[PDB]
Design a protein around this ligand. Sequence first.
Ligand SMILES: C[C@]12CC[C@@H]3c4ccc(O)cc4CC[C@H]3[C@@H]1CC[C@@H]2O
Lengths: 9, 236
Amino acid sequence: RXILARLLQ
Amino acid sequence: SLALSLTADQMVSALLDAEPPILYSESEASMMGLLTNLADRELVHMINWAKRVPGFVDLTLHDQVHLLECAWLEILMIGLVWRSMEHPGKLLFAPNLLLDRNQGKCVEGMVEIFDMLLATSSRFRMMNLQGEEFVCLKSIILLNSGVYTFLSSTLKSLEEKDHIHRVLDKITDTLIHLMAKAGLTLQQQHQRLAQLLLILSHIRHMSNKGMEHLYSMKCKNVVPLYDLLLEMLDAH
Ligand SMILES: C[C@]12CC[C@@H]3c4ccc(O)cc4CC[C@H]3[C@@H]1CC[C@@H]2O
């Protein structure tokens, strides 16, 4: 799952 | 392993340059919509900031996600408390959003939390908290809040924690260093250090009450569909 996941990567 | 080599002065400097931009802001529902819209936008910038916090990118992604999920509201509170510090009795959410205590009564149960936040702001003011201390405290919060809530079943997971506690040690040395430059006795330094870390304990408290309040407001259907904020909220 993720937005957090995507902005940290 | 950049983090552990940084000196006191390099740590403080590096933290002052990771500081996020101060955002401008744009009945009970509308008050909650106002505050959560700010919070949601800052979250985007808090992620950029966390990546610039020494030792943070060294963690696994799943642990980065874990620390931010645990600490985020604590991090918005300490920042709000800090910039309100010169504004007695007022909460400076944004440069165009300076809220009175009595403006907390717009929302059920919020004036209570405003009271807690303004008392913390007064404490920081009476202590003459420095900006260099603030950035140290906020990074401690990010690093320490979820460190105890990590998967304690893996050797890798046990190394992540050890690395986090070596970095937090660094920040303690950094705080001590700052207090010595300010010309404090050894006694006065470790007294100030403890007075500050004990405040992180009230901030964790304020954050627990605010998380309860926001989940309750979400249940009233008075929180807009801010995707990142709900993402953080729903990790509890
Ligand atoms: C989380 C709440 C909305 C967002 C508020 C906010 C929003 C932005 C910010 O920088 C700090 C804070 C601290 C208090 C928070 C509130 C306490 C309860 C309410 O639900």
